[PDB]
Design a protein around this ligand. Structure first.
Ligand SMILES: *[C@@H]1O[C@H](CO)[C@@H](O[C@@H]2O[C@H](CO)[C@@H](O[C@@H]3O[C@H](CO)[C@@H](O)[C@H](O[C@H]4O[C@H](CO)[C@@H](O)[C@H](O)[C@@H]4O)[C@@H]3O)[C@H](O)[C@H]2NC(C)=O)[C@H](O)[C@H]1NC(C)=O
Ligand SMILES: *[C@@H]1O[C@H](CO)[C@@H](O[C@@H]2O[C@H](CO)[C@@H](O[C@@H]3O[C@H](CO)[C@@H](O)[C@H](O[C@H]4O[C@H](CO)[C@@H](O)[C@H](O)[C@@H]4O)[C@@H]3O)[C@H](O)[C@H]2NC(C)=O)[C@H](O)[C@H]1NC(C)=O
Ligand SMILES: *[C@@H]1O[C@H](CO)[C@@H](O[C@@H]2O[C@H](CO)[C@@H](O[C@@H]3O[C@H](CO)[C@@H](O)[C@H](O)[C@@H]3O)[C@H](O)[C@H]2NC(C)=O)[C@H](O)[C@H]1NC(C)=O
Ligand SMILES: *[C@@H]1O[C@H](CO)[C@@H](O[C@@H]2O[C@H](CO)[C@@H](O[C@@H]3O[C@H](CO)[C@@H](O)[C@H](O)[C@@H]3O)[C@H](O)[C@H]2NC(C)=O)[C@H](O)[C@H]1NC(C)=O
Ligand SMILES: *[C@@H]1O[C@H](CO)[C@@H](O[C@@H]2O[C@H](CO)[C@@H](O)[C@H](O)[C@H]2NC(C)=O)[C@H](O)[C@H]1NC(C)=O
Ligand SMILES: *[C@@H]1O[C@H](CO)[C@@H](O[C@@H]2O[C@H](CO)[C@@H](O)[C@H](O)[C@H]2NC(C)=O)[C@H](O)[C@H]1NC(C)=O
Ligand SMILES: CCOCc1nc2c(N)nc3ccccc3c2[nH]1
Ligand SMILES: CCOCc1nc2c(N)nc3ccccc3c2[nH]1
Ligand SMILES: *[C@@H]1O[C@H](CO)[C@@H](O)[C@H](O)[C@H]1NC(C)=O
Ligand SMILES: *[C@@H]1O[C@H](CO)[C@@H](O)[C@H](O)[C@H]1NC(C)=O
Ligand SMILES: *[C@@H]1O[C@H](CO)[C@@H](O)[C@H](O)[C@H]1NC(C)=O
Ligand SMILES: *[C@@H]1O[C@H](CO)[C@@H](O)[C@H](O)[C@H]1NC(C)=O
Ligand SMILES: *[C@@H]1O[C@H](CO)[C@@H](O)[C@H](O)[C@H]1NC(C)=O
Ligand SMILES: *[C@@H]1O[C@H](CO)[C@@H](O)[C@H](O)[C@H]1NC(C)=O
Ligand SMILES: *[C@@H]1O[C@H](CO)[C@@H](O)[C@H](O)[C@H]1NC(C)=O
Ligand SMILES: *[C@@H]1O[C@H](CO)[C@@H](O)[C@H](O)[C@H]1NC(C)=O
Lengths: 747, 746
């Protein structure tokens, strides 16, 4: 029997999120142990809410009611297997009372709890992770957090405690010595004493960020300490923190770093000192001598307001950071990087990542990077180089954690990211004295030049090149041909010249690469080319041609572009989306590479599609026709293809499934008919001539008529439990009026 | 009666275009004289199609069926008043037989008519305008056009004849002397003889463009004459064309202009010579001495392929163009404009427009423009300055829109430097310019910090377009040297605004005493430095669309709560596309009380507090289209007396409250289209009041066509003063057998 309303999967989880549920489903499968109820409309939780679910080990009740939750005393107490309970964003006025002893994980993030009591927490002695963060913060109308004395001290198995984004004003005493990770960010703690961490000898992480914050240009309501003072850390505060691997002192207004802080911290691996006032400490820094095992150092955004110094002043003591792998120096702000300035970094054996983003750097002596031992990521993006809540409580608050360079680019080798600069022209010597760059990002440099096949000769082994978002003038057939190992080329958003009919446009250079694999020409507004109308490549596997004008290129009165993709003999993935196509001429379609396995023509305006032409494409496995205006399906698809496995047809105008459709089909595993105009599916369309190979049928968003007519399909839904129908709660009757909004499986 | 399926008016014209009609409506008013049936699915036409409509003077049957039209012989013959008949894009294989002699205008553009015959045309002696263009062209499977000899000679009142985009091979002989406009563009005519236009003494326009075309880099299938040869025009071809005002010789592969062509053409006003090979003629040009009344000369796109000369070479004979008003020289392609190179243009008293777009110009000595007597438009867009596809009814060789937005040009002298590379404005960039009122610096990759000194040489700019740069608004004094600024467009400068960690300063807005219109759209603004409020005594319109008010007005942050309050004079505010799910009450109440127009369309609003409309006594238009609203107030008139237009289309309203329509005697226009209404009950309809409602939009709603739809049908029939547009699109979604049917047809 099909699980409803939750999608149950035996990885036994009952994903039942965002299903407009107004209460705990009394139709949940018995063998469920993990129940996700997030983003619904649950307003009440009673001791009868989870009655026939005693086997439950995990409940997620986050964001209920979605867009305030009431939980009776002891509602969860009859669940002896409950290990993880997530009550985030539930506007809880108090910690739920009578929580079960079995809990190992409890999160009350983003509520209105201002009182952490013994009666709520102290019995929960099996707790390992406790998240009480984000209850009182910013300009929210909320109270100072009251933490009863000794509340955490009985929790002798507690490994993680998060109390960040609450007003504590003091580190709570009597913390359990089991603590491994202590999150106290943005807690309004201004003073750290010798006693505050005295017992925490197993502590591997300490986050004291956002205490006495640096509020200038803060993108959130930020209240500094008096006179913008620094956090006051006692000389001996970290004395017993011998196991510390992570320390976050971001935005604590530090001007001085006491080297004695790290005297007994020999395992310190990651040190976050963003958003402080440490330009002076960066230039002298006795503390750097205390971190021989440090791998990550973040000193981003320590700039002096109003300043634009000529050079970055890096202390020679940086040469002591022998284990350093990554240095983040965003937002120091300085005009020029000379080779001399980075001498202290050049003997560090493992320094692979240097991040100098957002420094308004105008000039760089690029040869310096060659003098490092093993740079892998040279990040210079965003400089001036010339020729219900907006903060995710579970993300870093001071920096995006996304990787610096796309992993697909980085995987090829050394990466040089010069995106968002002003290299509007690459001259004859731009890339001299560089390391062997394999991954090069020149995105958004306002480059309008005519690449001529000589500009990258100093770095001929570039394999992934990102030239997106420029204004490149493709007016030379030898462009980029010096890059004989080029595999991935991204030219998206270079529409500036393409859009102008009157200038010449030349793409013939595509053919000269022997190992070009992926070409992105998206959003170039290509509608006209000069002399050579065909794209050709023996190697190319993937062409993204979205956001261009195939409607014009293939207009009925023009034969010139009828074979535009035919010369891509090796092509298997082709993206023709967003080309304003109302139809594709038969000859044009039949001239698509016969080697295609994946074809996207979604988000056009297709009103017509010749299914017969699929005969020409015996390797086609996926056809994406979503977001068009099709009103018609063939009833003889099988005569046209025996290779198609996925057919995406959502968001069209299909109002009728033909007789003998599903069994015809036969090769399809996945058919997506959601968001069309189906009011019914006749017995004839189901038929069951042959045994289907279909494993997923999407049907939500269709205006189903829930009368006698819908019975044949409901009976079809029952027999074929091997055909997954996603979003049953959204597979809804649009009519008659008395049922409008009701899911069809409920009938 | 309620009019259907057409909308009728008095200009008495029945608008019936694009309504999925399968035949000519019979339900059209008896006073209708003009009938627009274009873009329908009409497929047959008989003498019975219009039997009810014998007083029709104009019919438009273009684009039927909207993707063959079959017209019976003499279908229109009983239409005694019929002067205008448009039959464009109807896949006609022939001219319809038995057209009425009353016809004075006939258009057969974009059909498959390869035979122009006496049986079709010759008896239409009242014809004044005959359009036969675009029947065979480009890569269309078609045949050569057979014009039967003398077919037009009986048309002695014919003033306009268009035969463009057909393969004619020769100018048809025996053309009527009455012709004033002759269009023969792209007709594969290689030779023009002395006889071709001999008797056309009233001709004011001759279009011979696209014959022996210049095909290089053509954005269409182009077939040049042999060897890319020039068109061949007899010395005397134009001898009796004394009345000619317009001559279009674009794309005729001309290398040489015979000055003698113009000897008897003393009224020539507009000369179009785009897409030829005239660089040599431009340098020499004896023909220029023959054109003292010429007002517009277009010599665009005459570039020598593969060339990039240092300078443009303008003949001294340009100084003979005494009446010249506009000179278009796009696509000549040259590296540098020097002052001496434009000497021959500088004494021309009426030359107001110079167009040098798309020349790949690297440098200009700007002081030269001062030496002209009367330049008003300096168009230098798209250079390198640093520190069916075609509409048959428009020009084929260039766009026809104004070079400069009229709203900008209206203030005075205009300088358009858009789409160049002025990435930095230094202290001398605008030295020695005329008094610029309108300045376009859009799309110059400019990432500089404006500081209040950059425009000091042209301190009188009134309209300033800085769109689509990467401006770093990091100085409170930016642009404050422009004391007279009235319009400032900073749209699409998101580059720095999107970075939280850099400073952003917008304080400069306050320093302008006559700033009226400010566009800050698509800047992705979500954080500002030090000053969180926009302020101005003068501003009347602010465009803040495409920013992040959802972040700025976040529930946990009171800093931007008065962000627009200081715009004390504002009457128009655009808050569209700010990803707003809800606006905090306090924030909404801090919007300027002077507002008359508020757009919050295309957000994701699920909530709107209708009570807050109380603090906005002058509000006339509220636009909430394209959100996710479900609830409508049931007492709007308690909350507003001024609201005249309320736009709610594309929301999720599924019920109208009992007092609804009756409450608001203020609302003239209510748009409820594309919501989730399945019915409208009698209750929600009226209490009989001083209701000013004149337009109600309801199309796109999933109406349940049962008896529950009955009250509304009755309401419509008993309330004719309320217009409901697109009534054919007011459709039953249910039940199954009724769906797709217009609710009026049940
Ligand atoms: C100060 O620095 C410290 C140390 O660097 C830092 O601690 C880190 O906090 C982040 C953010 O909470 C932790 O990252 C999370 O880790 C848990 C457990 O592995 C994951 O479940 C989380 O993954 C979810 O997060 C995202 C939700 O938006 C999703 O992208 C993702 O798919 C998951 O759903 C998340 O990665 C991180 O573990 C710690 N570091 C350590 C070593 O514990 C702290 O955040 C800094 N202080 C501030 C306020 O920035
Ligand atoms: C060669 O040069 C000559 C210049 O003398 C040029 O003749 C012009 O052609 C255009 C296009 O046919 C004419 O423009 C039309 O003028 C009439 C006025 O009676 C209007 O009805 C038209 O308006 C419609 O145009 C647009 C439709 O796309 C809409 O923007 C607009 O709202 C209307 O719907 C249209 O403006 C123009 O009148 C003549 N000029 C003269 C003086 O007669 C000819 O086109 C050139 N040849 C080629 C092939 O380019
Ligand atoms: C230009 O087109 C290319 C080619 O499509 C784009 O690069 C590709 O982007 C997709 C994401 O849309 C990547 O696919 C994804 O990879 C991740 C990581 O394995 C996976 O989790 C996803 O499920 C998905 O498979 C793909 O790897 C990537 N290809 C390459 C060679 O980088 C590119 O983003 C386009 N550029 C722009 C500006 O749109
Ligand atoms: C930034 O915002 C400004 C101000 O809204 C935009 O300019 C304005 O654009 C509108 C059209 O969207 C113009 O209105 C039109 O006027 C004519 C007649 O005057 C009428 O036919 C139209 O129906 C409409 O009313 C308006 O005049 C114009 N205002 C000014 C001062 O130019 C501007 O386009 C926006 N910039 C960008 C890049 O989006
Ligand atoms: C080249 O640099 C650009 C700019 O930093 C990168 O583009 C960003 O990519 C991220 C991650 O996918 C997107 O979320 C942003 O929208 C992009 N930024 C902008 C402003 O476009 C790009 O990913 C880089 N390329 C490689 C290969 O790493
Ligand atoms: C400034 O110059 C740019 C040059 O393109 C003009 O931009 C065009 O504006 C129109 C109307 O707003 C748009 O429809 C076009 O798409 C724009 N072109 C581009 C490339 O964006 C702009 O109109 C000019 N501004 C003024 C005041 O005239
Ligand atoms: C006006 C159109 O003339 C054809 C032409 N196209 C280009 C071009 N894409 N780029 C160019 C770059 C430098 C110089 C000339 C050109 C150029 N010329
Ligand atoms: C990460 C530093 O943030 C402070 C800062 N913001 C800017 C700015 N918008 N623009 C600038 C231009 C030149 C020099 C410095 C700045 C600058 N500095
Ligand atoms: C450098 O990194 C390697 C692992 O990549 C590690 O074995 C080695 O100890 C590191 N060297 C230093 C000085 O930390
Ligand atoms: C492309 O540029 C190179 C380098 O300037 C030049 O040698 C070659 O002639 C150009 N090819 C053309 C113009 O197609
Ligand atoms: C085509 O792609 C395949 C991998 O799909 C690759 O092995 C082969 O080298 C490519 N063909 C050519 C001739 O480049
Ligand atoms: C579809 O393609 C076939 C050839 O494969 C062709 O015969 C048929 O006419 C096409 N259908 C339409 C209506 O274009
Ligand atoms: C200049 O144009 C004006 C109309 O504004 C006109 O009065 C005058 O005759 C023109 N001068 C010449 C030389 O044609
Ligand atoms: C803005 O720039 C001007 C010109 O350099 C300068 O006088 C002033 O100090 C700057 N003001 C700010 C906001 O820094
Ligand atoms: C405000 O705008 C009006 C036009 O609506 C204008 O007349 C008036 O001068 C402006 N007031 C100020 C103080 O700028
Ligand atoms: C709407 O605003 C009124 C005051 O005008 C306020 O009392 C009420 O709470 C608001 N409505 C809602 C549901 O927020």
């Amino acid at each position: 029997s099909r699980s409803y309303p939750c999608d149950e999967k035996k990885q036994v989880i009952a994903e039942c999120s965002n299903r407009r549920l107004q209460e705990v489903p009394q139709t949940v499968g018995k063998y469920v142990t993990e129940l996700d109820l997030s983003d619904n409309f649950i307003t009440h939780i009673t001791n009868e809410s989870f009655q026939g679910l005693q086997n439950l080990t995990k409940i997620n009740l986050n964001h209920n009611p979605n867009v305030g939750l009431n939980i009776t005393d002891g509602a969860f107490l009859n669940l002896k297997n409950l290990r993880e309970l997530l009550l985030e964003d539930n506007q809880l006025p108090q910690i739920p009372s009578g929580l079960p002893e079995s809990l190992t994980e409890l999160s009350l993030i983003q509520n209105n709890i201002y009182n952490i009591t013994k009666e709520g927490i102290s019995r929960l002695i099996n707790l390992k992770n406790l998240y009480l963060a984000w209850n009182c913060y910013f300009n929210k109308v909320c109270e100072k957090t009251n933490i009863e004395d000794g509340v955490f001290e009985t929790l002798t198995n507690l490994e993680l405690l998060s109390l960040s984004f609450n007003s504590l004003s003091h580190v709570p005493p009597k913390l359990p010595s089991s603590l491994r990770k202590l999150f106290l960010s943005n807690t309004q703690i201004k003073y750290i004493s010798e006693e505050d961490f005295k017992g925490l000898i197993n502590l591997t992480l300490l986050d004291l960020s956002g205490n006495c914050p640096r509020c200038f240009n803060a993108p959130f309501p930020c209240v500094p300490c008096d006179g913008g003072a620094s956090i006051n850390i006692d000389r001996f505060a970290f004395q017993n923190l011998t196991q510390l691997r992570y320390l976050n002192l971001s935005s604590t207004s530090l001007r001085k770093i006491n080297a004695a802080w790290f005297k007994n911290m020999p395992h310190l691996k990651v040190l976050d000192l963003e958003f402080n006032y440490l330009v002076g400490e960066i230039a002298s820094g006795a503390f750097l001598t205390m971190l021989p095992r440090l791998e990550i150092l973040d000193l981003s955004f320590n700039y002096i307001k109003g300043s634009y110094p000529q050079h970055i002043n890096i202390s020679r003591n940086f040469s002591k950071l022998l284990s350093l792998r990554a240095l983040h120096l965003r937002g120091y702000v300085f005009q020029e990087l000379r080779e001399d300035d980075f001498q202290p970094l050049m003997q560090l054996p493992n320094l692979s990542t240097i991040n100098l983003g957002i420094n308004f750097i105008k000039q760089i002596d690029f040869k310096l990077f060659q003098n490092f031992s093993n740079l892998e990521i040279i990040y210079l993006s965003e400089n001036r180089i010339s020729p219900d809540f907006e903060f995710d409580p579970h993300s870093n608050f001071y920096h995006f954690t996304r990787p610096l360079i796309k992993p697909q680019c980085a995987a090829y080798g050394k990466a040089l990211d010069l995106s968002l600069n002003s290299i509007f022209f690459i001259g004859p010597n731009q890339f001299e004295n560089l390391p062997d760059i394999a991954c090069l990002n020149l995105s958004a440099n306002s480059n309008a030049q005519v690449l001529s096949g000589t500009e990258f000769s100093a770095i001929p082994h570039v394999k992934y090149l990102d030239l997106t978002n420029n204004r490149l003038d493709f007016d030379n057939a030898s462009a980029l041909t010096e890059l004989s190992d080029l595999e991935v080329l991204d030219l998206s958003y270079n529409s500036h010249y393409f859009r102008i009919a009157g200038v010449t446009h030349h793409l013939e250079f595509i053919q000269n690469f022997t190992n070009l694999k992926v070409l992105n020409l998206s959003h170039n507004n290509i509608y006209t080319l000069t002399d050579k109308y065909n794209l050709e490549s023996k190697s190319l596997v993937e062409l993204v041609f979205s956001g261009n004008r195939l409607d014009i290129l293939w207009n009925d009165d023009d034969n010139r572009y009828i074979s535009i993709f035919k010369g891509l003999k090796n092509l298997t993935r082709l993206d023709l989306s967003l080309n304003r196509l109302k139809h594709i001429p038969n000859e044009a379609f039949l001239n698509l590479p016969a080697s295609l396995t994946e074809l996207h023509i979604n988000d056009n305006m297709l009103k017509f599609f010749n299914w017969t032409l699929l005969q020409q494409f015996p390797r086609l496995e996926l056809l994406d026709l979503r977001g068009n205006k099709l009103l018609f399906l063939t009833d003889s698809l099988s005569d046209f293809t025996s290779s198609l496995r996925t057919l995406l047809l959502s968001h069209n105008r299909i109002s009728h499934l033909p007789s003998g459709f599903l069994s015809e089909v036969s090769s399809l595993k996945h058919l997506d008919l959601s968001s069309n105009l189906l009011k019914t599916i006749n017995k004839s369309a189901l038929e069951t001539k042959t045994t289907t190979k279909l494993s997923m049928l999407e049907l939500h968003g269709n205006p189903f008529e829930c009368t006698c007519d819908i019975g044949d399909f409901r009976r079809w839904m029952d027999e074929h439990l091997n055909v997954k129908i996603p979003r049953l709660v959204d597979v809804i009757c649009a009519s008659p009026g008395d049922q409008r909004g009701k899911s069809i499986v409920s009938l």
